[PDB]
């Protein structure tokens, strides 16, 4: 409060930790799928969310979400994760980039195609 | 020694030159001592294409500065035209 108190101890700030620490300030990271499985969300949601465990090129082992309907991911698949936590899955902080590296785009997707790696349907 | 040469400060295909007094070991567009005018080779008419501070130039020549070849030609233009 007082300025004598400020001269002896200035005001300090909040070193803000990032929610995506395994990206290390990179927009994407490449990793290999250690395991592909399904999890149940927490309340009040009910589903079988598609999820994978990924070992990154920097050695981190993280859990990534697979958005969209259907996927071709197996063990030993080389994917790209981007960042962005799933609200309702505990401990899932990254999204798999559809259409990049091994991961393929969603089928029959006609709207928001660029968010799922789907080519424009020629006709 | 200390020279009086031209530094290329323009855009691509539209060069513009500053006449500077610089130590000769420095880079062309690098460190200099004094700026004593400019030269615009692609200047339009009714526009000042060349302007030289002939009083500071004569001051540096008296102290032993050499003149570049292209600047020695500009001085003959600023004097013959005048």
């Amino acid at each position: 409060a007082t300025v004598n108190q400020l001269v002896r101890k200035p005001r300090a700030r909040k070193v803000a930790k990032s929610n995506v620490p395994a990206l290390e300030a990179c927009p994407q990271k490449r990793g290999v799928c250690t395991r592909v499985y399904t999890t149940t969300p927490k309340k009040p949601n009910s589903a079988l969310r598609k999820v994978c465990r990924v070992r990154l090129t920097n050695g981190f082992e993280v859990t990534s979400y697979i958005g969209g309907e259907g996927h071709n991911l197996q063990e030993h698949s080389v994917i790209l994760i981007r960042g962005g936590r799933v609200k309702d899955l505990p401990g899932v902080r990254y999204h798999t980039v559809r259409g990049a590296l091994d991961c393929s785009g969603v089928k029959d997707r006609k709207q928001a195609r660029s968010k799922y790696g789907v080519k424009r349907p020629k006709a | 020694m200390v020279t009086i040469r031209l530094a290329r400060h323009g855009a691509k295909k539209r060069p513009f030159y500053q006449v500077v007094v610089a130590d000769s070991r420095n880079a062309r567009n690098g460190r200099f001592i004094e700026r004593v005018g400019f030269f615009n080779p692609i200047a339009s008419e009714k526009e000042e294409g060349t302007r030289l501070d002939l009083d500071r130039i004569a001051h540096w020549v008296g102290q032993g500065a050499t003149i570049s070849d292209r600047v020695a030609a500009l001085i003959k233009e600023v004097n013959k035209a005048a």
């Binding site: 290999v32 030993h76 080389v78 590296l101 091994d102 020629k122 006709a123 | -």
Partner: protein, 130 residues
Amino acid sequence: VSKTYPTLHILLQFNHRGLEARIFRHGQLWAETHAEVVLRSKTKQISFLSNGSYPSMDATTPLNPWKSTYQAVLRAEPHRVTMDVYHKRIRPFRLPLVQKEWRTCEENVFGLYHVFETHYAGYFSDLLIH
């Protein structure tokens, strides 16, 4: 003056698994084929496309994949065949990265493909047709 002849557009993808060719016809995917051609560098890719062969392939690296794409346009003009290959996309008012031509005349798209396949002889498997 129109210059409309038989035409094929061939999307070519080099990747760590090999070389995939997708043949389009009036914008319709008409045929597929694959080749065991693994060549990572652009220089080696362009050398293969021009010469029709390359002596040593690169190693397959499933943990570090890649994908490099070209488009070939084949036209069967009345007296000669042309193929122009562009990196990543058709730029027709700009020159082809690779340009090949043959004196023989083929009337139909099947003859046109035969020219393509014979230049890359021994590499592409038989056509999967739709």
